[PDB]
Every structure is written in structure tokens, then in C-alpha cells.
Amino acid sequence: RVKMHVKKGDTVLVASGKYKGRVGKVKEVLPKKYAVIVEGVNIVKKAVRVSPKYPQGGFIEKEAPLHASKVRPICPACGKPTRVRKKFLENGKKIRVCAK
Amino acid sequence: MKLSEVRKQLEEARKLSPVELEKLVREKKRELMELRFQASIGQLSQNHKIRDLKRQIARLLT
Amino acid sequence: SGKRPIVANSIQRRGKAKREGGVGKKTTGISKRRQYPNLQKVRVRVAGQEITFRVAASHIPKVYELVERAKGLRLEGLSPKEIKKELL
Amino acid sequence: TAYDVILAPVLSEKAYAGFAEGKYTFWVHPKATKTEIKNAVETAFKVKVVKVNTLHVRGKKKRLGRYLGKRPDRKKAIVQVAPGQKIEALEG
RNA sequence: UGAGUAACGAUAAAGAGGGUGAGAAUCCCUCUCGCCGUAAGCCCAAGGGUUCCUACGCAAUGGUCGUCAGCGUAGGGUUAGGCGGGACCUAAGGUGAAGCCGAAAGGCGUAGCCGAAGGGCAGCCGGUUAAUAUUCCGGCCCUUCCCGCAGGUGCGAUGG
RNA sequence: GAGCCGGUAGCGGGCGUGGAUCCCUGGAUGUCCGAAUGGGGGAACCCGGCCGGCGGGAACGCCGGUCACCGCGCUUUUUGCGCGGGGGGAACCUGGGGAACUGAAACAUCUCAGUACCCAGAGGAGAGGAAAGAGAAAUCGACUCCCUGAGUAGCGGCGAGCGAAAGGGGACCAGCCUAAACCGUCCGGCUUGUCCGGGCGGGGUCGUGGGGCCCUCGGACACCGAAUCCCCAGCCUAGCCGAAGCUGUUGGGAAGCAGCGCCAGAGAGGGUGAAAGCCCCGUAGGCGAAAGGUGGGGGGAUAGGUGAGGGUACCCGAGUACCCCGUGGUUCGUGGAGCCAUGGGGGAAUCUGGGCGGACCACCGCCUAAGGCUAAGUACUCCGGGUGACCGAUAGCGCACCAGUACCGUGAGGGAAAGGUGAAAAGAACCCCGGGAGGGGAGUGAAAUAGAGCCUGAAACCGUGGGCUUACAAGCAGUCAC
Numbered sequence: 009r010v011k012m013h014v015k016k017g018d019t020v021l022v023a024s025g026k027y028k029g030r031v032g033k034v035k036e037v038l039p040k041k042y043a044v045i046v047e048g049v050n051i052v053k054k055a056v057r058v059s060p061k062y063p064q065g066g067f068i069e070k071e072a073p074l075h076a077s078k079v080r081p082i083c084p085a086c087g088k089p090t091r092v093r094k095k096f097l098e099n100g101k102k103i104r105v106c107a108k
Numbered sequence: 109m110k111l112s113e114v115r116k117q118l119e120e121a122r123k124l125s126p127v128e129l130e131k132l133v134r135e136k137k138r139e140l141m142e143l144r145f146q147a148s149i150g151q152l153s154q155n156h157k158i159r160d161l162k163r164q165i166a167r168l169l170t
Numbered sequence: 171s172g173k174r175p176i177v178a179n180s181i182q183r184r185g186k187a188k189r190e191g192g193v194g195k196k197t198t199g200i201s202k203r204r205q206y207p208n209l210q211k212v213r214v215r216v217a218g219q220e221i222t223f224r225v226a227a228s229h230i231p232k233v234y235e236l237v238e239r240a241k242g243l244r245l246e247g248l249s250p251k252e253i254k255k256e257l258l
Numbered sequence: 259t260a261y262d263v264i265l266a267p268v269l270s271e272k273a274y275a276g277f278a279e280g281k282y283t284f285w286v287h288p289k290a291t292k293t294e295i296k297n298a299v300e301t302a303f304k305v306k307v308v309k310v311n312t313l314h315v316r317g318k319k320k321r322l323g324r325y326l327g328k329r330p331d332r333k334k335a336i337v338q339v340a341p342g343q344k345i346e347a348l349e350g
Numbered sequence: 351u352g353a354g355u356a357a358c359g360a361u362a363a364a365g366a367g368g369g370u371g372a373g374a375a376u377c378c379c380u381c382u383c384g385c386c387g388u389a390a391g392c393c394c395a396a397g398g399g400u401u402c403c404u405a406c407g408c409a410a411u412g413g414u415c416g417u418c419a420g421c422g423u424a425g426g427g428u429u430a431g432g433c434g435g436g437a438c439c440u441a442a443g444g445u446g447a448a449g450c451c452g453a454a455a456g457g458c459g460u461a462g463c464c465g466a467a468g469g470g471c472a473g474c475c476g477g478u479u480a481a482u483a484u485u486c487c488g489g490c491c492c493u494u495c496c497c498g499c500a501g502g503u504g505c506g507a508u509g510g
Numbered sequence: 511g512a513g514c515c516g517g518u519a520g521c522g523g524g525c526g527u528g529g530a531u532c533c534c535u536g537g538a539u540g541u542c543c544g545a546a547u548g549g550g551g552g553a554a555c556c557c558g559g560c561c562g563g564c565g566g567g568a569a570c571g572c573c574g575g576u577c578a579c580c581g582c583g584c585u586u587u588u589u590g591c592g593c594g595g596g597g598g599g600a601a602c603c604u605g606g607g608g609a610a611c612u613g614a615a616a617c618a619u620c621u622c623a624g625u626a627c628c629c630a631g632a633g634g635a636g637a638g639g640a641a642a643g644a645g646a647a648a649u650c651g652a653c654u655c656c657c658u659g660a661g662u663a664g665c666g667g668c669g670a671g672c673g674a675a676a677g678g679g680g681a682c683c684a685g686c687c688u689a690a691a692c693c694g695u696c697c698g699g700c701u702u703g704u705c706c707g708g709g710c711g712g713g714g715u716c717g718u719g720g721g722g723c724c725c726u727c728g729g730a731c732a733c734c735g736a737a738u739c740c741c742c743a744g745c746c747u748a749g750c751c752g753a754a755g756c757u758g759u760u761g762g763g764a765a766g767c768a769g770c771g772c773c774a775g776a777g778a779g780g781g782u783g784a785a786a787g788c789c790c791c792g793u794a795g796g797c798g799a800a801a802g803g804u805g806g807g808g809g810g811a812u813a814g815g816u817g818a819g820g821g822u823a824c825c826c827g828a829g830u831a832c833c834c835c836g837u838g839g840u841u842c843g844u845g846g847a848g849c850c851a852u853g854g855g856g857g858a859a860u861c862u863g864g865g866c867g868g869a870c871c872a873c874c875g876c877c878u879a880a881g882g883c884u885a886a887g888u889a890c891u892c893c894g895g896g897u898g899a900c901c902g903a904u905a906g907c908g909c910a911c912c913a914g915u916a917c918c919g920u921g922a923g924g925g926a927a928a929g930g931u932g933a934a935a936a937g938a939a940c941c942c943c944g945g946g947a948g949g950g951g952a953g954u955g956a957a958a959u960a961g962a963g964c965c966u967g968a969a970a971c972c973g974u975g976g977g978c979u980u981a982c983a984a985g986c987a988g989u990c991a992c
């Protein structure tokens with residue numbers, strides 16, 4: 009429980025290190041590790057292939073899990089902290105001034 | 109989701125229920141005996157089926 | 171043991187031997203020792219059947235007093251031990 | 259609780275070789291009786307069973323890395339089907 | 351440090367050719383030689399618990415070496431109405447209704463119950479697997495139990 | 511309220527806003543062993559009765575149900591049926607038993623100590639508890655716990671040692687039910703009775719003595735009130751809301767430095783590539799339960815309870831009080847030895863009774879024994895939470911780690927060692943020597959003497975290279991001079 013955090017799968021700004029200011033959508037979020045993948049961090053896995061099945065398996069540069077505290081959600085501006093206003097039924101996150 | 113549907117059909121299996129469910133499990137335990145055999149020979153099974161079934165049997169048992 | 175209407179165990183209380191005057195002094199030697207309750211069997215009738223009581227010598231009478239109260243009592247039923255019991 | 263006696267067919271050269279005769283053989287519940295084996299294999303493949311042999315298989319004790327362990331025991335059983343008939347299911 | 355020292359675990363003993371292999375005194379085969387043979391051979395009981403068999407493999411285990419292995423990984427392997435034990439009996443002992451004893455815990459104890467390498471009980475010869483076999487198969491042979499029949503008789507028990 | 515199919519990646523294959531995983535509550539299912547409970551037994555196995563079912567099913571097997579012993583009560587003995595016991599729990603508690611070392615500078619009384627330990631039992635506590643009290647005040651007023659009283663009064667081979675109570679200050683606060691006289695009724699017995707007894711109901715509970723019965727008061731609606739009962743508040747077992755920053759600059763990476771600015775009932779603390787009130791998780795303040803648990807705190811009801819006078823002497827806990835013998839408790843070791851308790855012997859009384867105020871006696875006081883129950887204040891920490899001039903892997907629990915393990919012991923029982931790459935796995939493709947291991951290059955990284963039991967990486971110890979020195983020398987290995 010409570011492992012949950014900032015945004016889910018959507019647009020986000022990177023206030024990290026080697027990718028500060030960068031922007032992208034989050035294509036995965038690993039709560040078990042409190043990190044998310046965007047489109048930013050990319051390292052070279054010279055590795056032949058991960059699992060013995062399939063001959064070729066790639067030098068893939070794929071995106072490295074980014075620590076969830078180095079990414080802020082964003083909407084009609086520069087990404088604000090998340091408030092939560094409950095509607096007349098449910099509840100959804102209003103940014104520092106707008107919806108969604 | 110699967111639950112929802114399957115479960116209703118069981119107090120629905122109340123037309124001869126107690127008897128019917130019994131009959132039902134019997135076939136269900138068998139459908140799964142088929143699987144455990146097919147999985148045993150290996151190339152002829154794709155997992156989940158077996159657990160989804162095991163679990164069905166159970167709730168159904170109720 | 172103690173058992174019956176008696177109600178008396180066996181107390182372990184020491185016996186200390188001494189050498190003395192009382193008009194000059196009095197000195198010692200001391201050891202634990204167990205005092206037993208003088209204890210006898212009591213046989214009695216009570217309707218059919220006999221019935222014994224492993225009682226202390228003190229309350230031997232209490233037992234007869236009990237058979238007297240038993241006359242006012244409704245008993246039988248092949249109750250050898252059972253009488254004693256239902257015999258309060 | 260009847261398809262629960264027979265667990266799985268045992269796959270071995272030795273087990274296949276038994277197919278020649280009416281001798282089919284498979285893993286069964288460890289607490290299973292030759293008699294309850296019969297009435298089960300019978301009503302699960304519709305065939306008269308004439309004879310049942312059973313035996314336990316002490317599970318081999320393996321170990322992965324520093325962690326030492328044990329595989330589970332099983333009771334293997336070999337059914338003899340009435341002259342003629344056969345279990346197509348095993349015949350693969 | 352002693353120190354490349356003592357030791358490498360029975361003085362039954364070795365040699366060679368061929369093969370394998372990255373590597374061979376040390377693994378495989380062959381020939382020669384030697385040792386045991388009331389055993390150093392075979393079979394069963396206890397104990398031991400996969401060490402059995404096969405494939406792959408040598409870092410460590412092996413007092414050297416190691417391609418080998420009782421070692422690592424993996425797969426296979428133990429079939430019974432008659433063999434052994436149990437659904438039979440009782441021994442010493444144990445336990446223990448009844449009964450007795452004991453400050454508590456407990457101690458004793460008839461019947462009974464438990465307790466065997468003793469009593470009782472139906473399988474022999476041969477084949478087959480890498481690996482089981484009075485267990486699978488072949489031949490020949492037998493026991494108990496239930497049902498029915500036919501024949502026979504007072505049948506009937508933890509009691510005598 | 512977005513992910514999910516534990517630690518645990520991979521092969522393979524699935525699930526989720528038709529609201530999954532996950533968390534809280536309740537229910538279901540729950541193999542065999544264990545109090546172990548049909549019987550057996552070398553726990554985790556073996557064998558069986560009765561009833562119903564499953565298969566061709568009578569032989570066989572399986573499934574569902576059921577069958578231990580013991581106490582108490584209905585059961586007329588009967589055989590039944592019904593409620594209860596059994597076993598476990600770290601410490602704490604009470605009761606039955608109960609040491610020695612050691613101290614006394616030996617040792618026996620004495621001490622250690624009614625401790626250690628064994629046993630039974632109690633339970634969230636346990637024990638104790640409404641005066642046959644204390645003790646000198648013509649005073650106090652259940653019990654328990656703390657302070658004090660006091661190292662006093664005492665006890666003591668007057669050695670070593672041991673060591674009270676009343677009184678005062680606090681915590682807490684609460685009182686009750688029976689036995690008996692007498693009355694009614696059910697049953698038994700027998701020397702039928704105006705009875706004996708057993709059970710059940712009324713009645714009654716005290717020390718200004720109370721109660722019973724009789725007569726007078728009027729005998730009353732009222733008055734008090736639970737420690738039992740009901741509901742509610744509250745609380746616990748999941749959660750939720752929550753203020754305020756952005757730019758530049760050094761850097762592998764800013765949370766640093768600089769610029770300007772913002773919240774604060776919040777500048778506790780943790781994290782994010784380094785040093786952050788304003789990025790994340792929080793914190794202040796506040797919000798929350800369908801279900802289980804708890805719950806006089808508040809509220810309500812029932813049980814229960816409450817008066818005066820006069821007369822009669824019925825009753826007022828028995829092998830008991832009481833004295834004696836043997837002991838234990840107390841500060842009290844036989845001491846002038848009382849008090850409380852009690853193994854043996856003798857053995858009363860019912861208020862004109864009986865106990866006590868340290869032998870005894872008198873006087874004067876206090877108190878009502880031989881039936882029972884009772885909350886809180888107290889003790890403990892298995893468990894959850896909070897906090898530290900507590901530890902930081904030879905410390906801290908034996909265990910930070912897959913430890914009561916590995917290993918040792920027949921067994922009781924003994925009992926270890928072992929934590930750290932990196933911000934990230936980016937964990938080193940591919941080539942090169944090699945059978946492999948392991949190297950060299952390539953590549954990732956801020957860093958690879960961070961390269962995988964990998965942070966730092968000390969000392970002993972082993973080694974290559976370099977400088978100076980040594981084969982006519984006499985030695986605590988240094989020291990002084992050249």
C-alpha cells in the first residue's frame with residue numbers, strides 16, 4: 009500500500025540530471041522500485057542476447073528506469089504539483105490550477 | 109471479470125443445483141485432468157488454462 | 171493421605187532437638203520432619219452394601235452422624251462407591 | 259474427487275515398452291489404493307482393469323546453490339487392461 | 351618458523367602394445383606377470399539413504415595424476431494374495447479397566463491390550479532390463495474370502 | 511484507483527477504470543501429527559465398529575457422518591441426552607514442596623533464603639479485602655500499592671547478621687450474598703408423628719449488637735440502586751486531505767554558489783546522481799468505517815435494597831473455641847512469649863455468649879471466630895507504537911545475512927561463522943592467447959587499484975625493480991664520532 013506516487017502513464021518533464029528539461033510520455037512505471045521510464049535515459053547494453061532462445065537479441069540502447077522523483081507531470085504550462093479535487097461523485101487530480 | 113459471469117451461473121445452477129454443481133465439478137475436474145496430461149507431454153499446453161480452471165472448480169465448489 | 175470428612179493433609183513441620191537448662195541456657199540441633207494425621211478406617215452399612223471411610227481419628231463420629239443424615243436420603247441403585255459420593 | 263487419483267502419465271522408455279502388453283502406467287496419488295486406482299482408471303478411460311501394480315518413488319534430493327532441498331515423493335502405478343482393449347490417450 | 355622437511359595408510363607387483371584425449375604410469379581394450387580362494391568369492395540381517403544405471407562434465411572432494419569415480423548437472427530406475435512385516439498368537443518387559451498407595455508430580459496392579467529373529471501361514475524352475483524380479487513374462491502349482499448350486503450333519507463360542 | 515500474476519529474473523501464458531493486484535472486516539475450505547480423544551503406535555503411521563453414499567460390488571477399496579476418559583445435572587438402576595474439563599502461553603501471580611555454595615574470615619545454632627529449583631492452579635493479572643482489626647489516642651475504621659515512619663522498635667552463637675507495626679503524606683475507592691431461629695411445600699424413612707430427615711421456595715445477615723416470633727405504630731405509594739442487562743458517545747482493526755520556486759552557474763549528477771521570489775497552525779524526519787520549508791514521501795491542522803472488536807464514559811431498565819416502640823429468650827457457623835503436647839508464621843532463635851496458623855489428646859458456650867489489648871490476675875477498653883463473594887489503585891512485556899549525551903557488524907539479542915540453523919553430542923544439551931559494485935547494470939558485445947580458469951584489447955562509467963564476497967583497504971606476511979652495503983669476521987644488534 010501507499011507505494012503509489014506521482015503520475016501514471018502520460019506526459020512528464022524530466023528535472024533529473026543528464027536529461028533535465030527533456031520531455032516525453034511515460035511508457036512504464038515500476039512502483040516496486042519507485043521509478044518510471046520516459047524516453048530520456050538510454051544506456052548501451054552491448055549484451056549479445058538476454059535469454060538463450062533467439063539467436064540475435066540486440067545491442068539495444070533502451071531506456072533506463074528513471075527514479076520517479078526526477079519527473080514531474082505537466083499541463084497547459086510547465087508542470088505543477090498535483091492537487092486532488094473530488095468531483096460530485098469521484099475524484100481526479102487538478103494540477104496547481106487546472107484539471108487532469 | 110471472469111468471476112462475475114461464472115459465479116452468477118452457479119446460483120443459476122440452482123435448478124437442480126446441489127446435484128447439478130456436483131455433476132458440473134466432475135466434468136470440470138476432468139477437463140483439467142485432460143490438461144495435466146497434455147501439459148505432461150509438454151508441447152500441448154499454454155499455462156493459465158490450468159490455474160484459471162483450478163480456481164473455477166474452487167469457487168464453483170461453493 | 172487425608173481423604174474423607176476429615177479434611178486434613180499431612181503438614182511438614184520440623185522437630186528440633188535441644189540440650190539445656192533454662193536456668194543457664196538452651197542450645198540446638200534441627201531438622202524437617204512430616205507430621206501425619208492419626209487416621210483410621212471406618213466401615214458402615216448405609217442401606218444395602220458396606221462402605222469404608224479413610225477418616226482421621228478426630229472425625230470418626232462425623233461419619234456416623236453422616237449415616238444418620240443418610241436415612242433421610244433416597245438411595246440404592248447398586249451404589250457401592252456411589253453412595254459414599256452421594257453421601258455428601 | 260475421482261480424476262484426482264490419476265495425476266499424469268509417466269513418460270519413459272520403460273513405460274512405453276509396457277504399452278505392448280495391456281500395461282499402461284502413470285503417476286498417482288501417494289495415498290492411493292490399488293483398488294481405488296482400478297475404479298478410477300476404469301471410470302476415466304472406460305476399460306476393464308485386470309491387475310494393478312504400484313510402488314513408491316522416493317523423491318530425489320536436489321539442491322540449488324547453497325540451498326539444500328528435496329523433490330516430492332510419488333506413487334507410480336501400472337494398470338493391466340482386459341485383453342484386447344487399450345487407452346488411446348496413452349498410445350501417443 | 352620448523353620445510354620443500356616428515357609423510358603420501360599394510361612389501362599381493364609389476365610390464366608392454368593399442369585406443370581416447372588439450373593433457374595419460376594412473377581411463378578403456380588386449381597380451382604377459384603376481385595376490386586371495388572357510389576369501390580378498392557368493393548370498394541374507396542391521397545400519398546407511400540414491401551411493402544403482404545412463405548421458406554430459408573436472409573447480410573442489412580423491413593423501414600423485416585423472417579423460418576416471420562412490421565427486422558436479424541432468425534423465426531414468428525399486429512392480430508381489432504365495433518372500434518379509436502388517437489386517438494372527440502369545441514371551442520377558444511395557445501398558446493398564448477393576449483395586450491399592452502416595453504432599454503434588456507420581457508409584458504399584460487382576461483381566462485386557464501392546465510386545466519377536468519364538469509359534470502360525472499359500473511358489474517352484476526358467477526368461478527378460480543399462481538398471482527390478484519367488485515382484486514383469488512363460489510353464490507348471492496353491493491359499494483365503496463373498497455368491498450360487500449339489501451332497502452331508504444338531505449347527506453354534508472369547509467357555510471345556 | 512493503475513497497474514498485476516510473492517522473494518524471482520528467464521522459458522511459457524494471462525489479468526486489469528465491466529475497476530484487477532494490494533490493504534481492512536467477516537465467511538468458506540482447511541490432508542496427516544500434536545491435549546489428541548474409535549482402537550493401536552516407535553507423532554506425522556497402522557487397524558476397526560455403526561449409519562448413509564460411490565464401483566459390477568456380497569467378498570475389496572474409498573467418501574460423508576459418528577464412537578476416548580473424567581466431573582456436574584436431568585436420565586427411576588438402566589442406557590441415554592445436556593453443559594463443563596483435558597492442552598498451550600515470555601515474564602508476572604497464588605498455593606503445595608524446598609536446597610547448597612557462600613557469610614560467620616574454621617564450624618554445628620545462625621546466614622545465603624523460604625531465595626534456586628520441582629509441582630498444581632489463576633488470568634489479563636494474580637493474591638488480599640470489610641475487622642473476633644489495630645493499640646493507647648475515652649483515637650482509627652475493608653483490601654492493595656507508593657512515600658515516610660526506620661536501619662527505629664526489636665530479634666541475634668547479642669557474632670556474623672537479620673529487621674517490623676501503629677502513626678502521618680499519597681493512589682485508588684465499594685460494598686455485598688449466605689448459615690441458623692421461624693413459616694410454606696415436595697420426597698424419603700419410620701417406633702404414623704403435633705416427627706425425623708433431604709431437597710426447593712419465603713424469611714435473615716449484625717457490634718449504637720443484630721435477627722427470629724408476639725403486640726402497638728399506618729403501613730405505605732415515596733426513597734436509594736448495581737459489580738447484571740440494553741443502547742449511545744468515544745476508541746482500535748484499512749484509508750484520505752494537506753501550503754509555498756524558477757532561472758543562471760561549477761559539475762558525471764546540484765539539493766551547492768549567484769539572482770530574484772514564495773508558504774508557514776507545516777523550517778519533525780526520510781528520499782531524489784552532492785548539501786531542498788517551497789521536487790518527491792511526509793510534517794502542522796484536520797477527515798474517516800459497511801464489518802469485527804472494545805466500551806457507564808453518557809443515557810435507560812431490571813435484580814436488590816430502606817422505619818419506631820414494648821414484650822418473649824427461639825437463633826446468631828463444632829470435634830470449633832478453649833487448655834495441653836509437637837511445630838510454622840511475625841522483628842521474636844524458648845525468651846517473662848502473647849497474637850495468627852495447626853499435626854496429636856481432652857473438649858464448651860449462643861450475648862449473663864465468646865476472642866483480643868505480649869505470661870498471669872483485676873479494672874477499664876476494643877472486637878464478634880470456626881460459610882462465601884467483590885471493581886479500581888498494583889505486578890509483567892509474547893505482542894504493536896514512540897523515544898534515546900544506547901550499539902554500529904570482534905559492537906548491538908546467540909542470529910542485521912534463509913540461525914536456534916551448519917556443525918558437535920546416544921541424549922538432555924551445546925551452538926558458529928557470514929552485512930556494503932555502481933546514480934544507474936550501463937555487469938563488459940566482439941576480437942586475441944588458453945582445454946578451461948585467467949588474462950590482453952574493445953566497450954559502459956565521474957571513477958573499473960568500483961569488475962562482481964567488487965566502497966575505504968591499515969599491519970604481520972610473500973614478491974619484482976632500484977639505491978647503498980657485506981665472503982679474516984666475535985654478536986641485545988643500538989648508540990657516539992669520522
Ligand SMILES: [Mg+2]
Pocket residue numbers: 015016017018019
Ligand atoms: Mg496520466
Ligand SMILES: [Mg+2]
Pocket residue numbers: 056939
Ligand atoms: Mg551482436
Ligand SMILES: [Mg+2]
Pocket residue numbers: 085086
Ligand atoms: Mg513546456
Ligand SMILES: [Mg+2]
Pocket residue numbers: 123124128
Ligand atoms: Mg440443470
Ligand SMILES: [Mg+2]
Pocket residue numbers: 135
Ligand atoms: Mg453438461
Ligand SMILES: [Mg+2]
Pocket residue numbers: 169170
Ligand atoms: Mg455449497
Ligand SMILES: [Mg+2]
Pocket residue numbers: 171172173224
Ligand atoms: Mg488413604
Ligand SMILES: [Mg+2]
Pocket residue numbers: 178207226228
Ligand atoms: Mg485434624
Ligand SMILES: [Mg+2]
Pocket residue numbers: 172179
Ligand atoms: Mg492432599
Ligand SMILES: [Mg+2]
Pocket residue numbers: 185186187
Ligand atoms: Mg521433637
Ligand SMILES: [Mg+2]
Pocket residue numbers: 192193
Ligand atoms: Mg528458668
Ligand SMILES: [Mg+2]
Pocket residue numbers: 196197843
Ligand atoms: Mg539460642
Ligand SMILES: [Mg+2]
Pocket residue numbers: none
Ligand atoms: Mg541449616
Ligand SMILES: [Mg+2]
Pocket residue numbers: none
Ligand atoms: Mg538442611
Ligand SMILES: [Mg+2]
Pocket residue numbers: 210211212213
Ligand atoms: Mg474402626
Ligand SMILES: [Mg+2]
Pocket residue numbers: 220221222223250251254
Ligand atoms: Mg467405599
